[PDB]
């Protein structure tokens, strides 16, 4: 059973409540900006949910988690690590905006901190077994950390897609990762390349002498406009001017392994993006005359650090204001975009950058499932676009339940082994067997050895060995490089996923350019600087080679040293 709490406009709140008989699992607790008390009453209706799952880190899907923490209706908050780190910027920024706009704050900073107290993180393709369900996350090509949740329950397998990305995302993979098994219910979200032209018009403006103000969202969009201004061999400097967006740019660089395969495994933006930290340096650029690119972020020109630059660009004629994303209602960006106000600078728009996919990509997403889904609950988007996409999905022979309106799928467990010869020992009708548990779709079969005799009859990370890994972890544990706090934290990040473990060891092993310090524990005893670096690199390689090995094997290797983790 699935409930669609506000799944028509996403305002006044949003939520997808999957009610397994052992678990109320929530997905995408969000708010869409355009009210508070209806949001409260929507959260009250939600009830005690064992887990709130958040696909991406937009407030559209993760903007109502601290309110559920306030009402104590949520018990675990699972997301990707990048979603956790981005939501620790979005939530603080939302509360800052709520207080600065003098609208009764939807939650508090304490609520945000308690939300991160009950926040567990898991990465892509790592099945967690909670409450008679199996929850696996899969990349969907939206902003960083965004996923497509796959809850496998005894009543059926549900794939909540969230926002599927488009082919024009240059920092994520295009083909959105999907469950390789049977999806029964697809909760898909309906929609709402002239990228190089950006380069052209920016080469137009700088050579004409002016600057270029480029409005951008801080989540994903500024960091892709910046990659487009990075790979193009331009001549004038590009300057990011946004505290939240510079923080998100640093978070993109930190979470490099959770990005496109080319970019993971050197600055991602190839430097040349000289960052404006202090607001005095922003007033400097506001008063400056050097022709430069300003990838700043007030959003849709409403409030932020653009708002100072905007007046100087507005009075000037030989500059331009390239709008990139969707300008919305009751917002400055539309009024300067639709010509309510008189601009002297060129108002261009590049429709190429769009983190939401189009119709065809969503159709390809539905088609590339192994089995065609029984039902596609289109949820968000405009009504008209949803009618069009629903008609085309019907044309592809798939059932559509649009959010204005039932086979009993039941994964069974067949026994398939002889049960005649049983015995009683301790008032239990028991029988010893030696067999094989096979996991088929809709059916988990326990099957005897005879099944396996027929079935058998018919039929980046470095690579150290078990011995060398054991020897080097012992040596780096006895000179106090690998401590027990380090082994425990490595095991926690490895439980969070293999790329999380790679990020942890890369973050520890990274020698900071300015200080010249790596976050390992210095080696006890007499060693020179070259010897100390040769031991630190041994720690890096020995722990990176452990990430390739399986979970139980890592546990067995790392229980003789830290016997509690």
Partner RNA sequence: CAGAACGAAGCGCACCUAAUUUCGAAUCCAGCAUGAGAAGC
Beta carbon nearer to a second copy, 38 or 394: 394
> Applying CB under 8 A, which part among 341-349, 369-377, 515-523, 526-534 lies near other proteins?
515-523
Question: Counting contacts by CB under 8 A, is residue 397 touching a second copy?
Answer: yes
How far apart, in whole angstroms, are the C-alpha atoms of residue 112 and residue 500?
23
Site for RNA in 361-420 (CB under 7 A): 382
> Maximum CA pair distance of the chain?
92
The angle subtended at Cα 320 by Cα 317 and Cα 321, nearest 5°, is: 130
Residue 94: exposure state from Cβ atoms within 10 A (0-12, 13-18, ≥19): buried
Partner in contact with 163, chosen from a second copy, other proteins, Zn ion, none, beta carbon below 5 to 8 Å by kind: Zn ion
Applying the rule CB under 8 A, the residues between 57 and 76 that interact with other proteins are 72, 75-76
Stretch that binds Zn ion, among 68-76, 82-90, 159-167, 197-205 (CB under 5 A): 159-167
Secondary structure of residue 355 in the 3-state scheme: coil
The listed partner (Zn ion, a second copy, other proteins, none) that binds 97, CB under 5 to 8 Å by sort, is none
**In whole angstroms, what is the distance from residue 186 CA to residue 245 CA?**
33
Q: Is 221 in the site for RNA (CB under 7 A)?
A: yes
Cα gap 101→64, rounded to integer Å: 18
Provide the minimum distance between the beta carbon of 564 and other proteins in the complex, in angstroms, as a whole number. Answer: 9
The torsion angles phi and psi of 270, rounded to 5 degrees, stand at 55, 40
Pick from 441, 453, 471, 474 the residue near other proteins by CB under 8 A: 441
- Phi/psi at 296 (5° precision): -100, -175
Crossing angle of helices 306-315 and 279-286, in 10° steps, is 10
Residue 464's CB: how many other CB atoms inside 10 A? 19
Q: Which does 361 bind (CB under 5 to 8 A by kind): other proteins, RNA, Zn ion, none?
A: none
Q: Nearer Cβ to other proteins, position 110 or 194?
A: 110
To RNA, the closest distance from the beta carbon of 104 in angstroms equals 12
Part in contact with a second copy (CB under 8 A); list of ranges 65-73, 263-271, 294-302, 370-378: 370-378
Site for RNA in 327-346 (CB under 7 A): 328-331
Residue 224 as a binder of Zn ion (CB under 5 A): the answer is: no
Phi, psi angles (nearest 5°) of residue 351? -75, 0
Alpha helices in 183-231 (DSSP H): 195-207, 222-231
Residue 449 touching other proteins (CB under 8 A):
no
* β-sheet bridge partners, residue 136: 150
User: Which of the choices Zn ion, a second copy, RNA, none does residue 297 contact, using the CB cut-off of 5 to 8 A by kind?
Assistant: RNA
- Indicate the residue among 75 and 385 with the shorter CB distance to other proteins: 75
Q: Does 484 bind other proteins (CB under 8 A)?
A: no
The only residue of 58, 88, 305, 496 in contact with Zn ion, by rule CB under 5 A: 58
Given 287, 395, 514, 528, the residue binding RNA (CB under 7 A): 514
Give the shortest CB-471-to-a second copy separation in angstroms. 19
Pick one of a second copy, other proteins, RNA, none as the site partner of residue 414 (Cβ within 5 to 8 A by kind). Answer: a second copy
Which one-letter DSSP state was computed for residue 260? -
Q: Does 418 bind a second copy (CB under 8 A)?
A: yes
Q: Is 506 left (phi over 0), alpha (psi -120 to 50) or beta?
A: alpha
CB of 277 to other proteins, least distance (A): 18
Question: Per rule CB under 7 A, is residue 496 in the interface with RNA?
Answer: no
Q: Decide: is 436 part of the binding site for a second copy (CB under 8 A).
A: yes
Q: Which is nearer to RNA, 21 or 522 (CB)?
A: 522
* Mode of pairing for the β-strands spanning 212-213 and 293-296: parallel
Q: Which of 100, 287, 563, 564 binds a second copy (CB under 8 A)?
A: 563
Q: Which does 243 bind (CB under 5 to 8 A by kind): a second copy, other proteins, RNA, none?
A: RNA
Cα–Cα distance, 157 to 151 (Å, whole number): 6
Task: Examine residue 440 and tell whether it contacts a second copy (CB under 8 A).
Answer: yes
| C-beta closer to other proteins: residue 358 or 442 | 442
What b/e sequence results for 376-397 when a residue is b if at least 16 CB atoms lie within 10 Å of its CB, and e otherwise? bbbbbbeeeebeebbebbeeee
Which residue stretch of 80-88, 160-168, 294-302, 330-338 sits at the interface with Zn ion (rule: CB under 5 A)? 160-168
* End-to-end Cα, the chain, rounded Å: 38
Please tell me the distance from the alpha carbon of residue 247 to that of residue 251, in angstroms, as a whole number: 6
Give the 3-state secondary structure of residue 312. Answer: helix
CA atoms of 514 and 503, how far apart (whole Å): 21
């Amino acid at each position: 059973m699935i409930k669609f709490i506000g799944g028509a406009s996403k305002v006044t709140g949003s939520a997808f409540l999957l009610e397994t008989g052992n678990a109320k699992i929530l997905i995408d607790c969000g708010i869409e900006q355009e009210n508070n008390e209806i949001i409260e009453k929507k959260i009250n209706e939600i009830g005690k949910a064992d887990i709130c799952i958040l696909t991406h880190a937009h407030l559209a899907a993760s903007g109502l988690v601290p309110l559920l923490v306030k009402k104590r209706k949520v018990n675990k908050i699972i997301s990707t690590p990048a979603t956790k780190e981005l939501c620790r910027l979005l939530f603080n920024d939302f509360q800052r905006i709520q207080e600065e706009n003098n609208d009764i704050p939807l939650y508090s900073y304490d609520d945000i901190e308690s939300s991160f107290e009950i926040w567990d993180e898991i990465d892509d393709r790592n099945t967690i077994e909670l409450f008679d369900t199996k929850i696996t996350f899969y990349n969907n090509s939206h902003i960083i950390g965004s996923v497509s949740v796959f809850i496998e329950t005894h009543n059926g397998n549900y794939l909540f897609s969230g926002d599927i990305g488009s082919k024009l995302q240059q920092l994520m993979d295009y083909p959105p990762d999907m469950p390789d098994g049977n999806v029964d219910y697809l909760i898909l979200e309906s929609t709402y390349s002239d990228r190089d032209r950006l380069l052209e018009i920016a080469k137009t403006t700088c050579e004409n002498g002016g600057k270029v103000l480029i409005p951008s969202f801080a989540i994903g969009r500024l960091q892709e406009v910046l990659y487009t201004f990075s790979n193009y061999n331009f001549n004038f400097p590009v300057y990011i001017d946004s505290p939240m967006g510079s923080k998100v740019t640093n978070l993109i660089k930190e979470y490099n392994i959770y990005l496109k395969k080319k970019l993971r495994r050197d600055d991602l933006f190839n430097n040349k993006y000289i960052a404006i930290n202090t607001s005095n340096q922003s007033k400097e650029l506001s008063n400056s005359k050097e022709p430069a690119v300003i990838i700043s972020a007030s959003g849709m020109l409403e409030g932020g650090r653009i708002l100072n630059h905007l007046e100087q660009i507005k009075n000037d004629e030989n500059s331009t204001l390239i709008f990139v994303g969707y300008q919305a209602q009751n917002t400055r960006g539309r009024k300067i975009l639709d010509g309510e106000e008189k601009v002297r600078c060129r108002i261009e728009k590049l429709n190429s950058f769009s983190a939401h996919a189009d119709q065809d990509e969503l159709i390809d997403y539905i088609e590339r499932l192994k089995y065609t889904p029984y039902k596609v609950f289109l949820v968000h988007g405009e009504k008209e676009q949803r009618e069009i996409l629903a008609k085309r999905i019907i044309s592809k022979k798939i059932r559509v339940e649009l959010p204005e309106n039932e086979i009993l799928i039941e994964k069974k467990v067949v026994l398939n082994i002889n049960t005649d010869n049983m015995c009683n020992f301790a008032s239990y009708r028991l029988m010893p067997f030696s067999g094989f548990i096979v996991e088929k779709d809709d059916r988990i079969e326990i099957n005897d050895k005879n099944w396996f005799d027929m079935i058998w009859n018919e039929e980046a990370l470095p690579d150290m060995s078990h011995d060398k890994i054991i020897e080097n972890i012992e040596y780096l544990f006895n000179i106090k490089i690998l401590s027990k706090n380090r082994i425990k934290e490595f095991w926690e990040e490895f439980c969070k996923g293999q790329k999380a473990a790679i990020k942890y060891i890369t973050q520890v092993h990274r020698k900071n350019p300015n200080t010249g310090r790596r976050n390992w524990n210095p080696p006890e005893g007499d060693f020179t600087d070259n010897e100390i670096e040769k031991l630190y690199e041994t720690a890096y390689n020995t722990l990176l080679s452990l990430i390739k090995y399986d979970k139980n094997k890592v546990y067995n290797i790392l229980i003789n040293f830290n016997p509690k983790l």
